[model samples]
Target chain A: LHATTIYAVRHNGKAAMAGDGQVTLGQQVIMKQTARKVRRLYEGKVLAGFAGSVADAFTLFEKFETKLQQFSGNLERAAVELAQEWRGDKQLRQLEAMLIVMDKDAILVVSGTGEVIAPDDDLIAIGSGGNYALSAGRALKRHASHLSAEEMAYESLKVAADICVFTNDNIVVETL
Target chain B: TTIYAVRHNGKAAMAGDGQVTLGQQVIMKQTARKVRRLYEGKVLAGFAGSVADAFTLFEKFETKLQQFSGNLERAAVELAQEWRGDKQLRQLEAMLIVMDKDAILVVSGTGEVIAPDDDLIAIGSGGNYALSAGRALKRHASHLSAEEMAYESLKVAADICVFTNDNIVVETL
Candidate 1:
C-alpha cells in the first residue's frame, strides 16, 4: 500500500511542513522511502509534501522542481505548469496523489484539478491520513495559543501520527 | 535572547538601511523585510539569509504562534530564546518582522529597544538616514499609518541602496 501523511502549519514569518516515510507494495516492501515523499521546489520558497503512487508523486516532484526554477519560484506560474502537465500527461492522469504546498503568502492543496489552487485558510494538509491530520490542524489553527511555528508543527505531526498508520515517524520537515 | 519591537506611534515604520557589508563591499542592502504578511484570511511571514538556520527559527516561530492560536508575544519570546542558544545560528544576518491586524513587531538577533526612538526603525546602512528623516516627518507611537511608513522606508532605503551592492526590496508587515 502507498504510504505518507503530509501536513502544514503557519506562524509569523514562516510555515512548517511535515511528512512520514513508509512505502509498501501490496504484501512486499517496494521501498522504505515510499513515504519519502517530500521536496522543496520554487527555489526553496515552496515546500511540497505529497502522498500517492511513489512513481507518480516522484515524477511530479522532479517536474515541479524544474518548473519552479524556470519561473523564479513564482507559485502562480509553477501552479499553472503543474496543473497543465498533470491534466495532459496520460501517465500523470492515471496516477493517484495528493499534495500540500506552503508558500510565503499562502497555502495550496493539489488534487487532480488542472488549476492552481490556494487554500483560503493558512493551513493545508494532504496525504493518506490528511483528513484526520487536517481536522486536528484546523482546530489548532483556529484555537491554539500563539506558538512558535516549530511547536505548532510538532503538535500537528503529533496529531497526525496519532491516527495515521503510515506516518509513524516525523521523517522530514521544511519551512519558508 | 533579544526580542525587538518598535511602535511607530500612530504610523507604521520600516527597517534599517544598512546592508551587512563584507569588508568594504556590501553583501546585501539594508532592507525592510515584511516578515508578517496579511493575505485573505491568514497572516504571512518572510525571512532571508542562511537557508537552514533561517528555516529552523522560522518554523519555531510559526509553530509557537499556531500552538497559541496567534499569540504574538508568546511566539516572539520563544523565538528569542532559540535564537540566542543556537550556536550555528548566532552569526546569521537574518531578521523577521510580522504584521497582524493593527500591530507589527521586528524580531532580530539583537535585543529589543535597539531601534532608534522614532516613528520609524531602520537597520543596516540606510537606517540612520531614514530614522533621521522619519523623525522630523513622522512621530513615533502615533497613528501615522502603514502606507506612509512603507513609502518613507522605501525612499530612505532607495537613497542609500546605491552605495551598497544589495538590491533593495521592501514589504509591509
Candidate 2:
C-alpha cells in the first residue's frame, strides 16, 4: 500500500499514463523495474496507474479488466458493476487497492467508493510525489506558453522521477 | 442536431426521439441504440447510431484519446472529418455523445464542447421527447432527483417513441 510516487499528465486530447521503475521495501531497495505499475487494460482501451500493494492491485486489475471486456468494454457499466460486485462479493471488497485509469477520451480515478470518481477539476495526481506533480503539471498547464501535452506529460513524470526516491528504473510511458 | 445529453446539477436528461424513418408508417425501430458505448478500462464512450459505424468511429477515437491524453476537441474533429469523408458512413445517419472524466463533448464536423454550459443534450430518436420532458420537469417539478429526471426523460420517450423501452441505460459524471 505504500510505495514510490507516480506523476502523469493526460491532456492535449491525448491521455498519457506514466510511472517510475523503482521499488523499495521499507527503506531497503527491493527491486528495480519492480514498479511495472502502468497497466494496459480493456485490450488497450485504458491505461491504469497503481500506487498500492503491487500483487493485490494487479489482482484487482486483472479481474476488473476482464469484466470490462466482458461488457464489450463499457467502463461506466463495468466499473459500477464491479464496485457493486466488490461490495457484495465477500472476497472482492477486501481487495483494497487504488488506481487511476486514463483512456484516450477520459480519466477515471478509482478508490474507496469503488465508484470511478472522475474529478470535477481538469487535473489530479496521487502518490508521494502527487503534490509536487500536481504543482508542476498545473503550473505547466497554466504558464507554459508553447508546451505540448507530451511535454507537459513528460514534465510531470520527470518531476516525479527525479524527486520520488521510490521511483527510478520502474518508469514506463503510454500516451493516448 | 445533438442526439443525447445529461446535465450536471443532476436534474435534466435528453436523448433523441426521432427514430430513423425509412418511410411513412413503415418504420425501422428496435434495430439500434440511438446511443451506446465503446469502452476500454476506465474510459467509456456513449455513441449514437449505425452501431457498426459508431463502433468504427469509437475505435479511431479510442486510439486518439489514449494517444492524445484525453484531448477531446481535436480527437473529435479528426473523427468528425473522417465521418464526413467516409461517403458510405456519412450517409448512415449516425451521431454520438462522447464523454470521459478528463473531457465530455459532442463530436461533429462543426465543433465540440467540453464541460458544456447547457443543462442537457441528446441525439437520435426520442431526443425531442426527452428534451421536452426535461424542460417540463425543471419548470413544474423542481424537486425531481437526478434519477427521477432520467426516468422521466425515458418515460416521455417511451410514450412518444415506439422504439424506446424500459431497458434504458443511464450514466452520470
Candidate 3:
C-alpha cells in the first residue's frame, strides 16, 4: 500500500536504519528520486523511516518527536504511546502507513491499529518489498556474520529494489 | 494552538503544546516554542495561533515590558491596546497569556485583557480543556508544586486535544 521500503537492523551495540527515497505516488507519478524519509529524532538517538508519505502525510512525526522527548528516548514507551493514540483517535485511524523506528537498543514497527511489534531478531522491515528484504536479510543473517548492521540494511534494501518496482536503489541509511 | 497558565499554590506556571493548523502538511513538524520568559526572567509568557504573528507579539510585549520597567500588568495592557489599535497588529491572528509574580492575564486581539476570577488563565486552541483541568488540578492535587500542577494539566490537554502534544514546555514564577 506504500511506495518506499525501509530496512532497520540492530547489530552488536550499534543500530542502523536505512530507507529508499524513490517514492512512486499512486504508483503513477515519479516524484523526486532522493526523497528522504529518514528522520533523526531524540537528538539523533533514534532514526524513523516512514514507509510512505502518509507517515509524514499526517505529521505523525510531530507526535513521535514529542513522545521521544517525553520518555527521554525510551523507544518502547514512545512507540507504545503513539500506537495507543493512533488507534484511539478517529482521525489518525484513517492513516495507512507504518514506521520503522529504531534506537540503539530497540527496533519497533508501529501501525495505526494499536499494533506495536518488535521483531525477535531486532530487525524491522516495512513498506514495499518488505517481505523480500526480510527474507533476503534472513539468509544474510545466517550466511554473513561479518556484515555490519548498515551493510546488512544496504544489501537488504538493494535486494528489495531489484524485486519491487516501488522500491528504488536511492537509499538512505542512518545509524546510532 | 494550545497555550495556557496555571496560577495555583503560590506559583505561576505556563504551558504550551505543539500543532500547526495553518497548513495540514506542516502539522507533523511543529517544533516552534511559544512559551518563553521575559523581563530579566521575572515574567512568563505563552502565545498561540499564527506562528509568525505570535513572534511579533512576543517582541512587542518585551519592548513594552522594557518601556514599563518590567511591570507585566502595564506591559500587557499597553500591548493589548496597541495590538488592537495598530493596523499591523490588527492583521496578526494570535493570542497571548502573560503572567508575573502576582497577576495572570490573557491578551486577545479584540482589545481585551482578561483576568480569570479563580487566578487561573488560559488561551489558544485547547484553552477550554486546559481551563477545565486546571480547576481540577487545583482542587485534587493542591499538594503538588506549581510547576508540577501546570505540567500534568498540560499533559492532560496533550492527550485529549489534537492541536496539542506532550512536547510541553513549562515555566514558573
Candidate 4:
C-alpha cells in the first residue's frame, strides 16, 4: 500500500468510497494521472476501492466480485471467503494490494496479510495516504457531520492528495 | 449552560445557551457561543463543562475530525477513546453533543458516544429540561422547524435551570 490511497465511509444511512488517481512506479516515476481507482461492484449495490499493484488489484477485484456473486450478495461471507482463499493460495498471497469494500451497512478492509477488518468506527482506508484518509474520514464523520457519504469520500481524497505524492486530486467516488 | 439537538419534521438542529457560569456562583459570560460548527461548517458540536477542559477537549475533537476527514461518529469515538486512555486527558471532565445533518451523538470522557431514541439530545446545566421541552415541542409544534424547537427548548431550560440563561444561539441543517 504505498502506491495510492483508497478511502471509504458509511454515514447518514449511506456508504461512499473514493480513491486517488495518480499512479507511480519505483517510488519516483509518475506513470499516470487521472486513473480510475474506485468503482461500484455487485450490480451497483456495493463499493470496492483499491490501492497497490494495478494487476494485482484487478485480479483480486474480479475474484472478489465472483465470490460476491457466489455468496448471493452476502458481503461478509464473500469478503471472508476471499480473504481466506487469497491467503491460502501462495500465488494470490504474493500479490501486494489492499481492498476497502462496502455495502450500505458495512465497511470492510480485506488485506493480503490474511486479515479482514470491519472497523468498529464505520470508516476504513488503504494505500500511501490510507492513515491520512482514515483520520480524515473519522473526523469528518462527526465534526463535519453534515456531509453525506459522498461528500466525505470526495473530501478525503483531496486531503490525501495534498499530502501523499502517489495520490492525486483527480478522484473517483462510488456510493451505495 | 444548556444545549439541545433535535431531529423532527424533516430537519435537524442544535442550540446552546449563552450563560457561562463559574463555580455555580457567578456568570462569566452571558453571551458565550458554546455551540460550534466544525469540519468547515458541515458538522455541529455543543459543549458543557469547564471552559478550559471543554476547550481542550474541543480542540482535540477538531483534530480528530480533521484527521478522520470530517467523520462525525468515528472521530467522536476516537476522541472519547483517547480522552479516556490518556492519563492527562482522562483527568479532564466535559461533555459534548455532536451532530450532522442526520446523526446526533453525545460524547464524554467516559468513552461513551450516545445517540437518542427520539432524535433529540442535549447536554449542560439545563440539558434535561431542554430535552423535555424539545421533545414536547417536537410532538406538538408540527409547523415549527427544528431550529425553532431548539431555541424554544433552550428558553424553557433558561426558565427552569439556574445555571442556564435566556440568551441562546441555534443552528440547523
Candidate 5:
C-alpha cells in the first residue's frame, strides 16, 4: 500500500505535475526519500508520474513513450494504449502501478485494469497519498485561485506530505 | 459502444441497448444485438461501439478464451494485449463487458481490464445513466434478480439517453 504521491493541476494555459521523494516498502519502512517518481515524456511535452512499484512504474513509462510516439503525441490515445498493454499483456499484467499523465489540454489517470480516466476538474492524483493530495489540489484550485499550476501542484504535494506518512515534503514539480 | 454487466446473488447478467448513432446526427439502427453468448454459452459479452469493430474484438476475445482455457480474466487481458500492440487493432473503437459464472470484467481497447467493486459496471454512449440506474436498483430492490436489474437499467438508459433505445438484449449466467 505504500508508494509515492503524484498529483497534477492545470491553470493559466499550462499543466503542472508534482511528486514527493518518498518510496516505502510495505507501507512501513522508508525505502528511499529522494526517489524521482515523476518525469517528462515524448520530448518533454507530456508530464507523467506513478504511485506504485518503482521499477514497474518505469517499465510502464517506457511503454507509454512508445505508445506516445506511435499515436503521434496524442496524450489520451497514448495513455489508453498504455493502459491496454498494462492490462492485457501476460507479463505486463503482473506489474502494479497507477499513473497520472497530463499535457496542456487534459489530465488523465491510467490503471492496470485498462482504465483511462479523465478527471472532471482537470486534476488527478495517484499512489498511497493520492486521496490526500487530490482533496488538497481540488481545495487549492477552489480556494487559492491565484496560485499558478506549478504552485498548486507543489502546495498540494506539501499537504499530502503533511498528512500521509508515505509522502514527504521534498517534492519535485514539472510544468508543461 | 455501451454495455453493462452485473453479478448479484449467484447470478451474472449483461445488458445492452440497440441504438447506433452516426456522426452525432443520425440514428442509424435500433435493433442492434449488442449482447451475445460465446464459448458455447460459457461466456456472455456485451459491447458498445462500431458494430464491425466490436465483432473484431469479439473474435480476438474468443481466441484468447480458447488459448487460456476459458479463464475469463486471462482471455480478456490477452485480447487487450493484442488490441494495444497491433497497429490496426489499436485503432478499433469499442469497449466490452465479458462475464462467466466466475467473473464479470470490463475490457477496453486502451488495454484495460477491470472488475467492478460493487459487481456493477457499464460502458457506452449511455453508460453513465445506465450505471447510475443499475447501482440504485441493486441497492434498493433486493427482490430483483440480476437479469431484471440489467433489463431495468437499460430501460432507464433508454429514458435518459437519446442514443439508447427500447430494444435491449440481455444474457445471464
Candidate 6:
C-alpha cells in the first residue's frame, strides 16, 4: 500500500476536502500519479477522503455511503453508524484506513476504533502526510485570511506533498 | 471576573483574573479560581459570571463531557443545547471557555459554541481586551508558548478592565 494525504478545512462558512494524487507501491516506487482520493459524496453535499490501503479505504467509503443514505445525509449520524459497524463487526474491524468526512456545517473523522470525531477547530487530516497537512492547515487558517477553504485545502495538500515521499503535487480538492 | 484562553505552539491555555465585582460598585472576592480543570484534569475551563451560576454550569458541562465520551466539541454542544432549551437553566448568566488538548471552544448561555478561526478564543467582561492582546502576541511574540501567551493576555486585560485584576490563574493542556 502506498501512503497518501487527505485533509479537510472549514473557512469562510464553507468546508473543503483535498488529497494529493500519488500512490506508492514500496519505499522506492512511485506507482501512480493521478489517483483522485478526494470525493464529494451524498449528492455533493458531503465531501470525503481517506488514507491507507486503497482497496480497504474504498470498502469503508462504500459502507459509509450506504450509511449516509440510511441516515438521510446527516453526516454525524452516518459517521457514528459507520464507526460502530467498523468497530463491532469482526471482519470490518481489520480494515486499515482513516476517513475524513465533512458537510457544510460539520467536519468529522471516523476511525475503526468506534470513534467518530467532530473536530472542534474545523480541521481534520489523515494519511502518511497527515501531520504535515494538519500543521499547514492550522497555520493557514490562522495566518492566511485571504485564502478560501478550497484554496486552503489545496495549499495544505501541497505542503504535505512537498514533504511526504508518498504524496505528490497532483492535488484534487472538493468544496461544499 | 474575566477569563481568556488561547492556542499556541501545540498547546491550549486558559487564564482568569480573580476580581469578582458585586453589582457595579463593590469588589467582593479577589482570589477566586475562575479557571479550573474538569473531567479529571483532561479538560480546562474558565468561567465568567455569578459564582453559583458558573459552578452549576460546570457540573452540567461535566455531565455532558462524560456522556459524549470526552469529546469536547460534542459535550460543549450538549451543554449549549441544555442551556438554551431548559427554562431554568437558560437564565444562568455565564460564559465558558473550555479546552482539551485537541480543541478550544467558547460556550455561552446564548447557545453559541464558537471555535475561533484564529485559534484564540476568550470570554468575560475583559474578553475583547484579552482577545486583542492574544491576537497581537500570536503575530509579534512567536517565542512564547500558549501558557505564557495566556498569562500575558490576562495582564493586558487586568491593566485596563476594572472588573479584571492581576491575580491571574492559568491552566493548560
Give me the displacement of residue A28 in model 5, in angstroms.
3.4
Task: List residue ranges in candidate 6 displaced over 4 A.
Answer: B1-173
Per residue, candidate 4 scores C-alpha lDDT tens digits across A62-155 of 9899999999989999999889888987877876666888898888988777789898679888877778778788888869989898999889
Tens digits of per-residue lDDT for model 4, B1-173: 67888888678788887766466323447787888788788878888866566677778889999999978989999989998898887765667888877788888789988876768888876688988887788777868988888999988876556456668989877
DockQ of 6: 0.01
Pairs of residues clashing in candidate 6: none
TM-score for the second chain in candidate 1?
0.58
Those runs of model 2 whose alpha carbons end farther than 4 Å from true positions after fitting are A28-30, A89-97, B1-173
| Candidate 3 C-alpha lDDT tens digits along A1-176 | 35567888887677888888766655333444576777788898888877766545447888998988899889999999988987887887877777778888888988889899988788868776777788878877778868999999999988876556456678878878
Q: Against the true structure, candidate 6 has what lDDT?
A: 0.82
Distance from true location, Cα of B151 in model 4, Å = 54
Q: What is the DockQ of each candidate?
A: 0.01, 0.01, 0.01, 0.01, 0.01, 0.01
- lDDT of model 3, residue B62: 91
Considering just the first chain, candidate 2 attains a TM-score of 0.80
In candidate 2, what are the lDDT values of residues B83-157, reduced to their tens digit? Answer: 667667666554566755444577653333344556665565566777787778767887876546756776666
Query: Model 2 — TM-score against the truth?
Result: 0.45
Ranking by lDDT: 6, 5, 4, 3, 2, 1
Chain A (candidate 3) TM-score to true chain A: 0.91
| lDDT scores of the candidates, listed in order | 0.57, 0.59, 0.77, 0.79, 0.80, 0.82
TM-score of chain B of each: 0.58, 0.68, 0.91, 0.91, 0.93, 0.93
Q: What is the lDDT of residue B125 in candidate 2?
A: 56
- Please give the distance, in angstroms, between residue B71's alpha carbon in candidate 4 and its true position after superposition: 59
Top model by TM-score, which number? 3
For residue A158, give model 2's deviation from the true position in Å: 1.6
Worst 10 residues of 3 chain A by lDDT: A24-33
What lDDT tens digits, residue by residue, belong to model 1 across residues A120-157?
55776776556667787777777884776656666776
